[PDB]
Design a protein around this nucleic acid. Structure first.
Ligand SMILES: [Ca+2]
Ligand SMILES: [Ca+2]
Ligand SMILES: [Ca+2]
Ligand SMILES: [Ca+2]
Length: 294
DNA sequence: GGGTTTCCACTTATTCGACCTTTTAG
DNA sequence: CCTAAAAGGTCGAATAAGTGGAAACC
């Protein structure tokens, strides 16, 4: 069905990863082989998005990824030209853009077939050192060196509303909270919209307040890790801003159905049916089919 | 047919999503 | 007193990123 290219780039900001493998290989002339590419891993229920993306781009192979997940991997060298073209025209805007640029530099090394020389393998190692998690211990041991060039700090604005629809389809969440008290009904129904993201993109998440004209930021930490949530819990902002936004700029994948169910609940709250017993049980049943499982 | 690419099965680290209860604000 | 909104978390892998092994090329 062909995905809008900005929907795709938002989705990639939220679900894509680049990869640069530099593998010790006794069968290779320089003792190392490589593999360059881009991949997306989703729950099986979202296999269709990957099928559709594959068809849109015309590249990539789909395979299971463990018990409950499926992946679209693009590593065939010629096919990376499609990836490069797309992200040149519709650039990523999270810190993943830097990983993209690292990926582009490795592609050039290999385009010139330098990866078949030891000096080329060393270049890819330097490029890899700043990519994603960086070098393994093995590579750190075989190519000891000081990485001087620090990572480039991406600072780009939400380019348009479609990017944000694709982004939310990846890392967003539409949730029906059941706040149990002791009232006559003893359950307050609260719609929650949120987007989760690593602290490295706090500026982008922060901007969502101005961009959507509602919501707020929760900072979260656990040991050495830090992440951020853009959250909307105000019903009037759900009704007047959040819902209309995704009614026009469509979500993709199964989260679309979560949003639809979310909306059915929202209409029930707008009719004050969440305050009756019969509406509550309706809301309960709708919640049961949402998000995990479905 | 040797070196290199590309694929498919599966894992590791940890960034997400999804789920809770309480406190506070109207 | 009643209900909505926010605060303040927990849980666990649908996380983001990576790895082992080998078939398919040229
Ligand atoms: Ca993400
Ligand atoms: Ca993913
Ligand atoms: Ca996701
Ligand atoms: Ca729940």
């Amino acid at each position: 069905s062909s995905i809008n290219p900005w929907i795709l780039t938002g989705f990639a900001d939220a679900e894509g990863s680049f990869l640069l493998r530099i593998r010790k290989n006794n069968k290779s002339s320089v003792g190392y082989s490589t593999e360059l590419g881009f991949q997306i891993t989703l729950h099986n229920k979202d296999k269709s998005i990957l099928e559709n993306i594959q068809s849109t781009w015309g590249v990539g192979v789909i395979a299971n990824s463990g018990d409950n997940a499926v992946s679209l991997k693009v590593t065939r060298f010629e096919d990376l030209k499609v990836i490069i073209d797309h992200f040149e025209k519709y650039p990523l805007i999270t810190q993943k853009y830097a990983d993209y640029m690292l990926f582009k530099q490795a592609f050039n090394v290999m385009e010139n077939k330098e990866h078949l020389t030891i000096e080329g393998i060393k270049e890819l190692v330097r490029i890899k050192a700043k990519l994603n998690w960086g070098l393994t211990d093995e590579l750190k041991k075989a190519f000891p060196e000081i990485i001087s060039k620090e990572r480039s700090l991406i600072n780009k604005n939400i380019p348009n509303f479609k990017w944000l629809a694709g982004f939310t389809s990846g890392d967003g969440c539409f949730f029906v909270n059941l706040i149990k008290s002791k009232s006559k009904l003893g359950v307050q129904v609260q719609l929650v919209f949120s987007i989760s993201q690593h602290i490295r993109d706090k500026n982008l998440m922060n901007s969502l307040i101005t961009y959507l004209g509602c919501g707020y930021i929760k900072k979260k930490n656990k040991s050495e890790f830090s992440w951020l949530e853009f959250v909307v819990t105000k019903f009037s902002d759900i009704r007047d801003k959040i819902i209309p936004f995704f009614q026009e700029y469509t979500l993709i994948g199964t989260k679309l159905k979560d949003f639809e169910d979310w909306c059915k609940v929202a209409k029930l709250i707008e009719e004050k049916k969440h305050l009756t017993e019969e509406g509550l049980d309706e809301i309960k049943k709708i919640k049961l089919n949402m998000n995990k499982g479905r």
